[PDB]
Structures are given as C-alpha cells and as structure tokens.
PDB file of C-alpha atoms and ligand atoms in Angstrom:
ATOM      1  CA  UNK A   1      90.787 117.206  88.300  1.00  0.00           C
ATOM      2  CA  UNK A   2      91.133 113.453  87.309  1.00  0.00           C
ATOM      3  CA  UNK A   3      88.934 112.398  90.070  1.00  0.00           C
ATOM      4  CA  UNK A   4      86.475 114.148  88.356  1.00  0.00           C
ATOM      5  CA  UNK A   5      86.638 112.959  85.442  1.00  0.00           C
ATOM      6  CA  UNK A   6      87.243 109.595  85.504  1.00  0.00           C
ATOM      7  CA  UNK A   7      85.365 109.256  88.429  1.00  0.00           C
ATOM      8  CA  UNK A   8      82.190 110.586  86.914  1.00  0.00           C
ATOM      9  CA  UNK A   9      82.334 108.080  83.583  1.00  0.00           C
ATOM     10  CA  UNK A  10      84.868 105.507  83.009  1.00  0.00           C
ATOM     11  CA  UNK A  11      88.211 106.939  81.343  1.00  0.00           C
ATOM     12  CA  UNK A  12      89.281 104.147  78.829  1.00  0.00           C
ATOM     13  CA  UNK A  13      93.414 103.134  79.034  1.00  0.00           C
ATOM     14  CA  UNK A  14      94.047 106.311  76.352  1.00  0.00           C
ATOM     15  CA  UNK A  15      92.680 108.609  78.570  1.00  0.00           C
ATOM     16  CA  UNK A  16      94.333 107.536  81.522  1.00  0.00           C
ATOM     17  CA  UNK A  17      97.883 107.430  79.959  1.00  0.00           C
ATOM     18  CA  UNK A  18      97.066 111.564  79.761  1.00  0.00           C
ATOM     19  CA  UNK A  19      98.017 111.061  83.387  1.00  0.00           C
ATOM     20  CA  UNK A  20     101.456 109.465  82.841  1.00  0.00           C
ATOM     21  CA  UNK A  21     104.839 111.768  83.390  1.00  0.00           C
TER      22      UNK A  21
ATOM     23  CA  UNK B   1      80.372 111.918  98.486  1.00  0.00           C
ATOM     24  CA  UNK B   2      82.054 108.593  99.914  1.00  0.00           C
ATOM     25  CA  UNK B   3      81.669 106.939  96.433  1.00  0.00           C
ATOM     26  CA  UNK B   4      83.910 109.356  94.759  1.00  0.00           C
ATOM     27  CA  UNK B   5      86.440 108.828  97.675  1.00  0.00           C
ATOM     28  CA  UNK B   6      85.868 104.759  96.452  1.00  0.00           C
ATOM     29  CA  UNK B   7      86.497 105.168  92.849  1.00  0.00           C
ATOM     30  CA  UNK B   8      89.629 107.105  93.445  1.00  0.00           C
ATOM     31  CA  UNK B   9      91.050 104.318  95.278  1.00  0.00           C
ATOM     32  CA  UNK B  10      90.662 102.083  92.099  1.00  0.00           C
ATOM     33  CA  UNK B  11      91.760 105.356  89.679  1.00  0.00           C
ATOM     34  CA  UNK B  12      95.371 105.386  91.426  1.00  0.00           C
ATOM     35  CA  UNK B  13      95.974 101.424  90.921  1.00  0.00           C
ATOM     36  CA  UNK B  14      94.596 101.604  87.763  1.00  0.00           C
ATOM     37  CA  UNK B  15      96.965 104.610  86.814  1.00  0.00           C
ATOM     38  CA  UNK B  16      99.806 102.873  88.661  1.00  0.00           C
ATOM     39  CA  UNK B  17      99.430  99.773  85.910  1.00  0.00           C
ATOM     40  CA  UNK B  18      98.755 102.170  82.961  1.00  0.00           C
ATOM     41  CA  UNK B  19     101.887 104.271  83.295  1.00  0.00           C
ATOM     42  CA  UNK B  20     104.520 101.830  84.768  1.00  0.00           C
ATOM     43  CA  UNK B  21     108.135 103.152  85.266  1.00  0.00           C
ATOM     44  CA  UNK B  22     106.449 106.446  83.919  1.00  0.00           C
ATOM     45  CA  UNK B  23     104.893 107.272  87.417  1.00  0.00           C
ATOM     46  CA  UNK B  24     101.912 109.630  87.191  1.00  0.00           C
ATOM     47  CA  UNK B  25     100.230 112.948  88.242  1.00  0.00           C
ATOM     48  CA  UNK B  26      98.009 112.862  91.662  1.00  0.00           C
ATOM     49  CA  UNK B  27      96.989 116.150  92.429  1.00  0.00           C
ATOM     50  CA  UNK B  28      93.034 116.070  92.763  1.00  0.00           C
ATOM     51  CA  UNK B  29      92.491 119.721  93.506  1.00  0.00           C
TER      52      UNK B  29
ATOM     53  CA  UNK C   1     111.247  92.031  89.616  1.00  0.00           C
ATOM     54  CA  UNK C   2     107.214  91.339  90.463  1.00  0.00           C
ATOM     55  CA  UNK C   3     107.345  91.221  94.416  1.00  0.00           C
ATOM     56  CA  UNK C   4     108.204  95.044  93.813  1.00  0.00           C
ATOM     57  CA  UNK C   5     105.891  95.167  91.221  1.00  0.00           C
ATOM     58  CA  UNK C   6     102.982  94.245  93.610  1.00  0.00           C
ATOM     59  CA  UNK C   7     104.829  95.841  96.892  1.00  0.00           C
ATOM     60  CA  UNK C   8     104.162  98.951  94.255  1.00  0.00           C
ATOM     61  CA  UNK C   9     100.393  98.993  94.123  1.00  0.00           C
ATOM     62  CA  UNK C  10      99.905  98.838  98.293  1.00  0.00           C
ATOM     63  CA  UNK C  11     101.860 101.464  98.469  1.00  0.00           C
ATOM     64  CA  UNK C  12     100.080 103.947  95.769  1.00  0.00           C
ATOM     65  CA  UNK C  13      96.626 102.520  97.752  1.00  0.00           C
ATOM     66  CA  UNK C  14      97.677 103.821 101.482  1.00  0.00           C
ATOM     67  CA  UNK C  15      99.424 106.959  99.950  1.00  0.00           C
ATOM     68  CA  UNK C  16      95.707 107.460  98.291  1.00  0.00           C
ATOM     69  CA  UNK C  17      94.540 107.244 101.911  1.00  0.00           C
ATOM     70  CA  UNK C  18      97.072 109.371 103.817  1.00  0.00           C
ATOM     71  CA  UNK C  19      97.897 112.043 101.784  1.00  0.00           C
ATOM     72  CA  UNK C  20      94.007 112.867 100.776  1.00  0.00           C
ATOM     73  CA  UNK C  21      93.471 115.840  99.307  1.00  0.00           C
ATOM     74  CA  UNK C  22      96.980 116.499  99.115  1.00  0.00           C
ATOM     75  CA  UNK C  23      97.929 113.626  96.362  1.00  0.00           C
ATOM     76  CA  UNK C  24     101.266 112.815  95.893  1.00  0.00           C
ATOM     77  CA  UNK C  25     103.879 111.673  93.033  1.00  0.00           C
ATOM     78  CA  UNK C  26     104.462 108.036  92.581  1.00  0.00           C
ATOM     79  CA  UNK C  27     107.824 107.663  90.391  1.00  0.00           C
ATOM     80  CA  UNK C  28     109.079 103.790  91.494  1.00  0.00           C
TER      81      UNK C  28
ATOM     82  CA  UNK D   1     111.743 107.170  96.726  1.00  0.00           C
ATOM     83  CA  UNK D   2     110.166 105.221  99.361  1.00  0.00           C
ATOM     84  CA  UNK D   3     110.548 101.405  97.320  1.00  0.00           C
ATOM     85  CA  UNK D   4     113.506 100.937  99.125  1.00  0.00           C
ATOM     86  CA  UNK D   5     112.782 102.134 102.757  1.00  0.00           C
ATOM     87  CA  UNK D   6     109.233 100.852 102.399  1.00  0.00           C
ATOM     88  CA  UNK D   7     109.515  97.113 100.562  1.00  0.00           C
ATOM     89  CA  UNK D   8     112.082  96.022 102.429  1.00  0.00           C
ATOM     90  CA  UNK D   9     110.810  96.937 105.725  1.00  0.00           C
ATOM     91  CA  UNK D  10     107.085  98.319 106.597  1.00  0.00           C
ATOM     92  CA  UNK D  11     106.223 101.604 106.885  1.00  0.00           C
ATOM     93  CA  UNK D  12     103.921 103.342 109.435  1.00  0.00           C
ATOM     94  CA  UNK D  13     101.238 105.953 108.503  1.00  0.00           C
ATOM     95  CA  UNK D  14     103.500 107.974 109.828  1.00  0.00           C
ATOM     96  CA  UNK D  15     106.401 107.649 107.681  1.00  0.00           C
ATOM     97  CA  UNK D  16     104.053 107.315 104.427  1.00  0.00           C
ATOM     98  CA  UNK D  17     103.563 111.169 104.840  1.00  0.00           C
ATOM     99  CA  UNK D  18     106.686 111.675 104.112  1.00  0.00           C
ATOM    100  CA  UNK D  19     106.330 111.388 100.627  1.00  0.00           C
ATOM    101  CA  UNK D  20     103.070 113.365 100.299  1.00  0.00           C
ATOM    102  CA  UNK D  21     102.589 116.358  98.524  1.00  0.00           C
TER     103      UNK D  21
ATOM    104  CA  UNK E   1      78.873 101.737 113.830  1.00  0.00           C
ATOM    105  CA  UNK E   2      81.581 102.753 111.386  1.00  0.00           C
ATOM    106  CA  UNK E   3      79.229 101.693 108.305  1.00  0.00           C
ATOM    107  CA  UNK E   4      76.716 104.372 109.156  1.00  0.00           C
ATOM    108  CA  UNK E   5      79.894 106.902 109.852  1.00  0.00           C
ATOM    109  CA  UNK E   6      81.822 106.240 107.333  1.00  0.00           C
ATOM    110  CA  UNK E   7      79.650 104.973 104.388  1.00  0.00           C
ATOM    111  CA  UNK E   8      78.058 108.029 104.374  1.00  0.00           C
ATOM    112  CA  UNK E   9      80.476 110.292 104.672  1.00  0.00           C
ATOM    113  CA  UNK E  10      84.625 110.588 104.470  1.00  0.00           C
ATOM    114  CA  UNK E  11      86.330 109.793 107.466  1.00  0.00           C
ATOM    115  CA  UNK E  12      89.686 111.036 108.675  1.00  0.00           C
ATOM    116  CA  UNK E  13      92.814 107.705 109.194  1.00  0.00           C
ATOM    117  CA  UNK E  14      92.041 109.552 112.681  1.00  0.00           C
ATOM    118  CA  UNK E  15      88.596 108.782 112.791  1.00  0.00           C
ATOM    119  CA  UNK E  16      89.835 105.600 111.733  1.00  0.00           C
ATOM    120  CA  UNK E  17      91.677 105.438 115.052  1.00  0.00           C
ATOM    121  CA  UNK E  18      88.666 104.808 117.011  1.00  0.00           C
ATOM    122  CA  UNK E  19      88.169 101.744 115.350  1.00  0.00           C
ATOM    123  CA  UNK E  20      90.944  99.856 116.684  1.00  0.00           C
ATOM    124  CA  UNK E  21      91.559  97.310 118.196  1.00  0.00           C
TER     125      UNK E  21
ATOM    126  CA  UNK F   1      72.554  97.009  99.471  1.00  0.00           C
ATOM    127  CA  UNK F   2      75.992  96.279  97.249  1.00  0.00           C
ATOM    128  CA  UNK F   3      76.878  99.969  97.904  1.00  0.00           C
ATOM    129  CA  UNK F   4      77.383  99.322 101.770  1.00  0.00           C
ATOM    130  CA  UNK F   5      79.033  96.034 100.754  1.00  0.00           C
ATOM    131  CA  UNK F   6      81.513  97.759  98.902  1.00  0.00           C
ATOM    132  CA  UNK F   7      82.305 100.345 101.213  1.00  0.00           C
ATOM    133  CA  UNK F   8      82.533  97.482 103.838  1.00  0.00           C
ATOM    134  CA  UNK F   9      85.639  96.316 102.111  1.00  0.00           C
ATOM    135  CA  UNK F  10      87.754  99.731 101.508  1.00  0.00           C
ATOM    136  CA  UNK F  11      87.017  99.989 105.236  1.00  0.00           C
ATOM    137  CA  UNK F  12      88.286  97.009 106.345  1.00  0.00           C
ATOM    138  CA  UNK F  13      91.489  97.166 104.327  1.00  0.00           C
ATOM    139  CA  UNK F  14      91.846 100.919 105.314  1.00  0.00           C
ATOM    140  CA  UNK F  15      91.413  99.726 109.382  1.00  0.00           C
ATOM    141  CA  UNK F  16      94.004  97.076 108.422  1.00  0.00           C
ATOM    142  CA  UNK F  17      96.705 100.050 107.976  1.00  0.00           C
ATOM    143  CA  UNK F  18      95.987 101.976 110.866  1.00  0.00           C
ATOM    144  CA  UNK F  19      95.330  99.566 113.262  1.00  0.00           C
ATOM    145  CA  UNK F  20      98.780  97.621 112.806  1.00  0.00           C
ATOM    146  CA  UNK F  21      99.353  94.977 115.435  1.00  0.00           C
ATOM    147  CA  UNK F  22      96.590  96.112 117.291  1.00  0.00           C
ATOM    148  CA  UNK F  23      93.891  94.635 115.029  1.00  0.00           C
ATOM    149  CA  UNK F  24      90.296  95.571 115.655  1.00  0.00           C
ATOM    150  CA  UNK F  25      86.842  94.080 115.070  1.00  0.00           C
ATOM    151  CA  UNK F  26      84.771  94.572 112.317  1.00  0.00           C
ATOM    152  CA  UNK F  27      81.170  94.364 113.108  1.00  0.00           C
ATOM    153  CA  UNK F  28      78.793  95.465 110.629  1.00  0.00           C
ATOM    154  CA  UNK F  29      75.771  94.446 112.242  1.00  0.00           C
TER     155      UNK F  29
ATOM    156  CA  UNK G   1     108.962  91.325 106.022  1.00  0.00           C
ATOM    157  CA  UNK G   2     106.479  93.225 104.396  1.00  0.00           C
ATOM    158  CA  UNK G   3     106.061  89.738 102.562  1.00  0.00           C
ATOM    159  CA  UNK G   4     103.562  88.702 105.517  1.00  0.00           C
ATOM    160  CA  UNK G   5     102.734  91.957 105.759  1.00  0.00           C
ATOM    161  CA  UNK G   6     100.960  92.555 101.864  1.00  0.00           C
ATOM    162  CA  UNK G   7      99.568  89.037 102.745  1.00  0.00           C
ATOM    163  CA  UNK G   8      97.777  90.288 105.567  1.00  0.00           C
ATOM    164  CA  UNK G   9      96.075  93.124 103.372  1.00  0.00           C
ATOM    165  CA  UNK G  10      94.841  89.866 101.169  1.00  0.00           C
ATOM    166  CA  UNK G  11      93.650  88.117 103.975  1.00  0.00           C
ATOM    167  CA  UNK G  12      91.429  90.639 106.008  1.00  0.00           C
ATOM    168  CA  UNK G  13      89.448  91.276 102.410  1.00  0.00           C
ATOM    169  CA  UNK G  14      89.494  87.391 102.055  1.00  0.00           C
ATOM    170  CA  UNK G  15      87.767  87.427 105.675  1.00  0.00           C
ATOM    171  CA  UNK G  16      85.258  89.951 105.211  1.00  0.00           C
ATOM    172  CA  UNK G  17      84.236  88.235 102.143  1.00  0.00           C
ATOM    173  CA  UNK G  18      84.054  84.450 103.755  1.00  0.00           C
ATOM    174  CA  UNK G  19      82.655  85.924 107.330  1.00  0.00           C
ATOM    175  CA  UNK G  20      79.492  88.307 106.074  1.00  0.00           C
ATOM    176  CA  UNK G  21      77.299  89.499 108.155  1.00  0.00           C
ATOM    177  CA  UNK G  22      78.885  87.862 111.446  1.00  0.00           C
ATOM    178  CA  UNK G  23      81.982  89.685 111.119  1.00  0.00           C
ATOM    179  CA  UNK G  24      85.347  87.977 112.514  1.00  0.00           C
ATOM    180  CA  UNK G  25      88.410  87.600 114.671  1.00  0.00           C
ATOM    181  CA  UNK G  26      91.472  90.052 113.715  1.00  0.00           C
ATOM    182  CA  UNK G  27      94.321  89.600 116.780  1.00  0.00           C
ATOM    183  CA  UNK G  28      97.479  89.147 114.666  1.00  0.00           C
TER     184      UNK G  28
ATOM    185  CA  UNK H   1      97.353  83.756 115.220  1.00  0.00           C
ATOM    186  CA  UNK H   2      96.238  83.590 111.398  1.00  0.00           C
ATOM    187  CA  UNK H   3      98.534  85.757 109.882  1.00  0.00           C
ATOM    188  CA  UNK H   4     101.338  83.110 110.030  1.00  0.00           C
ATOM    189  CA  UNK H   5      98.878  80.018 109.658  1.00  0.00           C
ATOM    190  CA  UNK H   6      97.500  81.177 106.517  1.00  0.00           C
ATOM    191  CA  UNK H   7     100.397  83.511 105.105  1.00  0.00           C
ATOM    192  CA  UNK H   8     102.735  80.586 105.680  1.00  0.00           C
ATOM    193  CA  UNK H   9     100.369  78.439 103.383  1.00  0.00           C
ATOM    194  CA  UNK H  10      97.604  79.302 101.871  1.00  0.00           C
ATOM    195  CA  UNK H  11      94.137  79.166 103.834  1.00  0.00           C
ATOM    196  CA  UNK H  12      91.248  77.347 102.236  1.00  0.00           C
ATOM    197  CA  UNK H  13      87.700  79.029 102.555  1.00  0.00           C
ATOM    198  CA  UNK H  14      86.405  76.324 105.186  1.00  0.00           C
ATOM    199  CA  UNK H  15      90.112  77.018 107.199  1.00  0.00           C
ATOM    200  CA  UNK H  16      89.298  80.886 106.724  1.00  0.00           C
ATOM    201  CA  UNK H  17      85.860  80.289 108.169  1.00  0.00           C
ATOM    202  CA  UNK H  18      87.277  79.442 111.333  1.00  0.00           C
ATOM    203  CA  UNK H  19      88.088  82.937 111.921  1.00  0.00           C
ATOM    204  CA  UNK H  20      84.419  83.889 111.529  1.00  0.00           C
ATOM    205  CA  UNK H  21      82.077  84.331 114.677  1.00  0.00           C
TER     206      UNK H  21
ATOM    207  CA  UNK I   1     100.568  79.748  80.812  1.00  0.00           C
ATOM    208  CA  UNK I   2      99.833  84.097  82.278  1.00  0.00           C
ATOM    209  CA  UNK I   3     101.262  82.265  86.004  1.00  0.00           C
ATOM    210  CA  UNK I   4     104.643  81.616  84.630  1.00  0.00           C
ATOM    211  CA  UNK I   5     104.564  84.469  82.334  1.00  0.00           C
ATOM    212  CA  UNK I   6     103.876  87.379  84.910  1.00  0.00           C
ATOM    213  CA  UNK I   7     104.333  86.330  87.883  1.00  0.00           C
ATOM    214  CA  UNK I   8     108.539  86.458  87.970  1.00  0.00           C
ATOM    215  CA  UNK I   9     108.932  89.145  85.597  1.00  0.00           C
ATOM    216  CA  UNK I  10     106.265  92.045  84.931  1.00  0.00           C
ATOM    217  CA  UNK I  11     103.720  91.541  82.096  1.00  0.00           C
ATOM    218  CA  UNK I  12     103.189  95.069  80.333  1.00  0.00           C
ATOM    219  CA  UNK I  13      99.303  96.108  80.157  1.00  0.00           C
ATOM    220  CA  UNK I  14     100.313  95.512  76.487  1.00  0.00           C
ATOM    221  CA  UNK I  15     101.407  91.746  76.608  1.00  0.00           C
ATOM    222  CA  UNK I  16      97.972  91.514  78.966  1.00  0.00           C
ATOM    223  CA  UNK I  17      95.898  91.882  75.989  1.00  0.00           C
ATOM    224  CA  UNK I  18      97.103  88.825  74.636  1.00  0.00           C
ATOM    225  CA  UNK I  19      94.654  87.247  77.330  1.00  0.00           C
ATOM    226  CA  UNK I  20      91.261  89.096  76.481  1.00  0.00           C
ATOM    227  CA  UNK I  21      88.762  87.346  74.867  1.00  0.00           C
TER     228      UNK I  21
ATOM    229  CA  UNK J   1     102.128  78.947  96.906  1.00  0.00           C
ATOM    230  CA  UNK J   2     101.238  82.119  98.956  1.00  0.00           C
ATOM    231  CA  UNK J   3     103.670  84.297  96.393  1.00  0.00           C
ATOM    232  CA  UNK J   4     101.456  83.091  93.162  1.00  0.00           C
ATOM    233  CA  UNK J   5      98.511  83.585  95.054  1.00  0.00           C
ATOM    234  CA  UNK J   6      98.813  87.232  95.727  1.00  0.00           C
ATOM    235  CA  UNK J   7     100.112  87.552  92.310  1.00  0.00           C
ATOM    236  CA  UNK J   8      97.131  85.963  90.627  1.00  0.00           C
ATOM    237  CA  UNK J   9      94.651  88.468  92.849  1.00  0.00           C
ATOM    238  CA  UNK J  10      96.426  91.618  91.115  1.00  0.00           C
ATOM    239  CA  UNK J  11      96.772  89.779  87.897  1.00  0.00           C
ATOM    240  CA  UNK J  12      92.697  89.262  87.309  1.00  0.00           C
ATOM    241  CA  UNK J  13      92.381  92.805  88.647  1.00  0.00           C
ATOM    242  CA  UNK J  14      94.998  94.143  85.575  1.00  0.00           C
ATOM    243  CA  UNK J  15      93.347  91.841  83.340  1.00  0.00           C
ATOM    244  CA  UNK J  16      90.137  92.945  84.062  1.00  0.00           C
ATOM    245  CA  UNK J  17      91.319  96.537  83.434  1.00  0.00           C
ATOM    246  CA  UNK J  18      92.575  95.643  80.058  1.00  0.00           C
ATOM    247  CA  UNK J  19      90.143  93.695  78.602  1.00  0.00           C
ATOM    248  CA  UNK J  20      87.034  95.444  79.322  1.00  0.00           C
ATOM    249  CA  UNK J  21      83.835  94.805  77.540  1.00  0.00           C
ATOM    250  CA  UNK J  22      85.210  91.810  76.392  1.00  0.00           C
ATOM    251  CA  UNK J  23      86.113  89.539  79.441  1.00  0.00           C
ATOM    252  CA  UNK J  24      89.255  87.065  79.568  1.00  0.00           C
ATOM    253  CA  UNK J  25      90.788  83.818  79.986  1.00  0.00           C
ATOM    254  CA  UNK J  26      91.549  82.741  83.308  1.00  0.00           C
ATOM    255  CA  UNK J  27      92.845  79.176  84.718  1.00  0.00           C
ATOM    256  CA  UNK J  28      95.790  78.706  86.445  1.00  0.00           C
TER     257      UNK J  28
ATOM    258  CA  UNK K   1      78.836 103.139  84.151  1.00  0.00           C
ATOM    259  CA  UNK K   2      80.780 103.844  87.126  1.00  0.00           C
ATOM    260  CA  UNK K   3      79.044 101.933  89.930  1.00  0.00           C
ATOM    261  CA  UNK K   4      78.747  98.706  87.823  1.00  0.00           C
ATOM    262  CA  UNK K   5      82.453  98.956  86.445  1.00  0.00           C
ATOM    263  CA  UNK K   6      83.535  98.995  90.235  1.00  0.00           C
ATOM    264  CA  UNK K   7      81.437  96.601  91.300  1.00  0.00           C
ATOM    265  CA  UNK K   8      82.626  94.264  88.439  1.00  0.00           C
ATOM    266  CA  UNK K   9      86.272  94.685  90.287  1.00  0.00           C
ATOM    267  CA  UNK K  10      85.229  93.575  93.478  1.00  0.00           C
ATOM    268  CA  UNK K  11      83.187  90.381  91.675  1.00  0.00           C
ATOM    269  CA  UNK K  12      86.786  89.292  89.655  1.00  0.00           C
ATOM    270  CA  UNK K  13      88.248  89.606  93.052  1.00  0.00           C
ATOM    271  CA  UNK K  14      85.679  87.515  94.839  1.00  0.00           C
ATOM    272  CA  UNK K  15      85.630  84.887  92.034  1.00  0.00           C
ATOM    273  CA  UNK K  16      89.254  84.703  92.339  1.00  0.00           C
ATOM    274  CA  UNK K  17      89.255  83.519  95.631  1.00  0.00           C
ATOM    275  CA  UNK K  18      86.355  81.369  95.204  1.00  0.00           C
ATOM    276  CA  UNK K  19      86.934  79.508  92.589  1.00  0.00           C
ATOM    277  CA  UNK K  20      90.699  79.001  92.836  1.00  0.00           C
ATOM    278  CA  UNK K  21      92.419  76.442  90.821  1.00  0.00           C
ATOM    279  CA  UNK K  22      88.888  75.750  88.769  1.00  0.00           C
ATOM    280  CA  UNK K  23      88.742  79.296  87.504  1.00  0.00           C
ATOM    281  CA  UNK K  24      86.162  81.317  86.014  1.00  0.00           C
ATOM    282  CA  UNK K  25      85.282  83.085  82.838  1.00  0.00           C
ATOM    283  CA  UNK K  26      83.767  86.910  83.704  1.00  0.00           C
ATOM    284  CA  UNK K  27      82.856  88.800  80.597  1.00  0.00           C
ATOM    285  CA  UNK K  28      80.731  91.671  81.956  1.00  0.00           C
ATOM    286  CA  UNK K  29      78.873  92.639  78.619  1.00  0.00           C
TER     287      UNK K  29
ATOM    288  CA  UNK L   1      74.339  87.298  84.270  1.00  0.00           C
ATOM    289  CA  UNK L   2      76.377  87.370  87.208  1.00  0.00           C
ATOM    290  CA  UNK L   3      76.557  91.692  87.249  1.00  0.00           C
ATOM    291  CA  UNK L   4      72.809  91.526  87.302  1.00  0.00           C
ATOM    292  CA  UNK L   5      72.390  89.054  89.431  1.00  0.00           C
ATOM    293  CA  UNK L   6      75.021  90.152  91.659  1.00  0.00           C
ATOM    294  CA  UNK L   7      75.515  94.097  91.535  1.00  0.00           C
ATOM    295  CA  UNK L   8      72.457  95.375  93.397  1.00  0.00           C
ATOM    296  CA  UNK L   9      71.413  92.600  95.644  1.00  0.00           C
ATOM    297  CA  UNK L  10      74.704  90.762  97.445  1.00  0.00           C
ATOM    298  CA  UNK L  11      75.711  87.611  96.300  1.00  0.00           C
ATOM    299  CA  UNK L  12      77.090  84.595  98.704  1.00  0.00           C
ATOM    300  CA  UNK L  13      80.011  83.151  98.368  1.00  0.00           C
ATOM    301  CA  UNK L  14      77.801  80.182  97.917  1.00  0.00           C
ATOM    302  CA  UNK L  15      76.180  81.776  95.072  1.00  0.00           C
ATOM    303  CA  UNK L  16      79.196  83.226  93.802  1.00  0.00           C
ATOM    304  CA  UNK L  17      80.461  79.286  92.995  1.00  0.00           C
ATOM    305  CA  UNK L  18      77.863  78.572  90.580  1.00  0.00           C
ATOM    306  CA  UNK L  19      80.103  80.719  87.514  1.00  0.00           C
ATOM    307  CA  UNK L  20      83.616  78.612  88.639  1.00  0.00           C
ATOM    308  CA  UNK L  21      84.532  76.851  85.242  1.00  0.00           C
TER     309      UNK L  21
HETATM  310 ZN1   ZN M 101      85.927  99.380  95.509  1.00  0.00          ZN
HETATM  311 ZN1   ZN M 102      98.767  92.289  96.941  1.00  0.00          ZN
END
C-alpha cells in the first residue's frame, strides 16, 4: 500500500499526488 | 515495526498539503 | 481561511492514530 | 465532514471514529 | 516505561490509556 | 539514540490526545 | 476553543524538547 | 496552569523551562 | 514577507516554491 | 502572536517538504 | 533515505522554536 | 553539518542555537 512505499524510500511530491482523489 | 508506524504519521500530513481541497486515499492494507 | 487550514492537519494526524489499520478518507 | 463539528468545538477519540473507515 | 513498550513495538490509544494522568 | 528521541515525541503528542484534561507525566528515564 | 486546544499539541512537543531527559509537569 | 499562560502569549524557552523538573 | 503571505490565506505547495533556495 | 506562531511551525514543516535537497529561506 | 529525511523534520521543527525571530537557514544536502 | 552532527547522536537545544542566523 502507500505505507509501503513511501515509507520504504522517500516518494517525491509527483508520486504522492498519485494519492490525491 | 514502530518506525513504519512513525513515517506514516508524517506520509498523511504530507499528503494532506500535497492534495489540498482534493482530499486523498488512506487505506494501508 | 488558514486557522482551518491548520485545524486540518491535527485532525488527519489523530485520525492516523485512531483509525489504524483501518485508514480513513479526508475530503475537507 | 467532521471540519465543522470538530474545528469549532473539540472532538474526543471517541467521536474521531466516527469518520473512520 | 512506555519508551521500552512502545518504541519497540505499536501500542494500542488503549495501551495509551495507562499512561495517563 | 535519535531513534528513541524521535519516538519520544509521537508519544508525547499521541498521550496529549488521549489523556485530555487529565494530563499525565512523561518520564523517560 | 479548539484554538487553545491545537496550541496545547504545540506546547507539549515544545516541552519535551526544552525539558530532556528530566521530563516535566503536564496538569492543564 | 500553562496552557492559558503560554497559549494566551507566547512562552519563551527560559518561561517553558519552568515546567521542567 | 511568507508571514503575511500564508498565514491569512493558504499558500499552495506551488506558491511555496517561490521560497526554496 | 500565538496565531503566527503555530502558523510558522506548519509553515517550515511545508516548506521543508517542498524544497527538499535544496533548503529555504526562513526569517520572519 | 528515510530515517534521515524524518529526522530532518523534527530538526526544522526544533530550530523553529529555537531560534525564533533570528531564524535559521537548513539546507540538508 | 547539522544532520550529521545531529541525526545519530541528540543534539541540545543548546547546541541546536549555534545554526540560528
Ligand atoms: Zn517523526
Ligand atoms: Zn498546529
């Protein structure tokens, strides 16, 4: 999930916005 | 572990700035 | 309007804590 | 919803749940 | 205590509980 | 240890929401 | 007021930070 | 207590410190 | 200066940037 | 001078965020 | 690096409150 | 630099005042 992910290397801004409705 | 439960405290404010009015997804299963 | 703005983040931070595994939707 | 019941006057734990998945 | 407890591993707002007051 | 540090201050904050008017002590001796 | 209330987060973190290892006084 | 003395204005570090044991 | 520009109305993550170095 | 306080703590924290690698201006 | 980039969250924080109206530069490179 | 000065071993607050501008 995106604790996994972003939790085991830094997500940059782009890759957070994925997570945006 | 506990660290991972630390991070994800700083993951949901950080995806509270990114997206705004947007909102965002939170299901970590 | 900031003071919701910032009223915005404690709330997403003890959701985090309460709802655990769980999650929830933060729409705001 | 929760900016209005929850800014304007606290919240509990309790109440928080409430808008948990 | 509560560093040893819950640095180590997760612990429950109920857990938590003990903790006060 | 920074780890312990760190944790230390999610803690606190966390105690600070379910401990309302109550309070409580934080000791990490 | 959660005004005083989101303060209060601020200044428990501000506390642990200033007290260290001696820990402090929380009775609101 | 402190909530109001230092949520009213804002605390310096050496007024926080009082607070410490 | 970023006190009276985002503190009474929300600064986007965009007008942030402005700020970096 | 409490409200600009508590909005300056989650202002480095965004800016911080943003600017990464390469740090950021801060004075107030 | 995760561990340093949180760490670097709590240090802006810290300096924050520290340093008040002086300020402080923090680039973490 | 203050993350490797400060990221493994805990800085003071007293320490921590030596990077204030
Ligand atoms: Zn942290
Ligand atoms: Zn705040």
């Amino acid at each position: 999930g995106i604790v996994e992910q972003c939790c085991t290397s830094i997500c940059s801004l782009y890759q957070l916005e994925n997570y945006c409705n | 572990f506990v660290n991972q439960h630390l991070c994800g405290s700083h993951l949901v404010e950080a995806l509270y700035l990114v997206c705004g009015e947007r909102g965002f997804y939170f299901t970590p299963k």
